[PDB]
DNA sequence: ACACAAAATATCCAGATTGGGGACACGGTGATAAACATGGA
């Protein structure tokens, strides 16, 4: 009934993004028409989910919260063939209760890991040439919930590239030894 | 009170040796709290 007028309006919510509530300032709605609600139904399934944590002196792999990757899809016909096989070829080295690839320091590190899984499926699948004609932007958000609340920690999005390549291969041959290399 | 003259050649260290032995901390702990957002009749 409410897709018949997808012209129409209606109020936001905290299962999709969240902001359009209190609004810090004011006791003031939000803009929006019901048809793009509608289409946010189904995001997270294409989102990219990164485990961080935090080192204690121990040295244990404190896990805490999430890290999600959103890209901006600029060929929506390229991207939906890209994927299937993307996903289908993951690392499947397991460490305890998560995978190897699972466990990245700090946020940028799962979204640049994604830009190279991207380029190596890329030289497998045929038809796509450069990361940029199939993403333009890269979205980065780190969520941790408390109690009844969810705190939020940093969102970002910055230009991907892909002059990074080598960046990778340097830590992995690098980083596995010690544990305070990531700095670098 | 006048004048004249006020040094010259050789030489200025040679050997042997510059540390040895033992030891470089012991235990106990490495924050604790309070600060909500959406739904159905």
Same mark, same amino acid.
């Given at each position: 009934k409410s897709l018949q007028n997808a012209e129409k309006t209606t109020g936001q919510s905290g =299962?999709?993004?969240?902001? =359009?509530? =209190?609004? *810090? =300032?004011? *006791?003031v709605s939000t803009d929006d028409l019901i048809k793009w609600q509608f289409l946010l139904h189904f995001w997270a399934f294409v989102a990219q989910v990164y485990c961080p944590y935090i080192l204690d002196k121990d040295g244990k792999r404190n896990f805490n919260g999430y890290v999600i990757v959103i890209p901006d899809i600029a060929n929506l016909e390229d991207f939906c063939d890209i994927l299937p096989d993307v996903l289908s070829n993951r690392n499947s080295k397991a460490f305890g209760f998560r995978p190897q690839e699972s466990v990245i320091d700090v946020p940028e590190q799962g979204a640049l890991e994604l830009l190279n899984l991207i380029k190596q499926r890329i030289a497998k699948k045929a038809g796509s040439g450069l990361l940029s004609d199939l993403i333009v932007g890269v979205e980065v958000i780190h969520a941790e919930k408390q109690g009844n609340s969810i705190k939020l920690h940093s969102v970002s999005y910055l230009q991907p590239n892909e002059?990074?390549?080598?960046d990778y291969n340097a830590i992995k041959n690098s980083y596995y030894c010690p544990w305070f290399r990531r700095q670098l």
């Open positions: =299962a999709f993004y969240l902001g =359009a509530m =209190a609004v *810090n =300032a004011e *006791n002059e990074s390549v080598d």
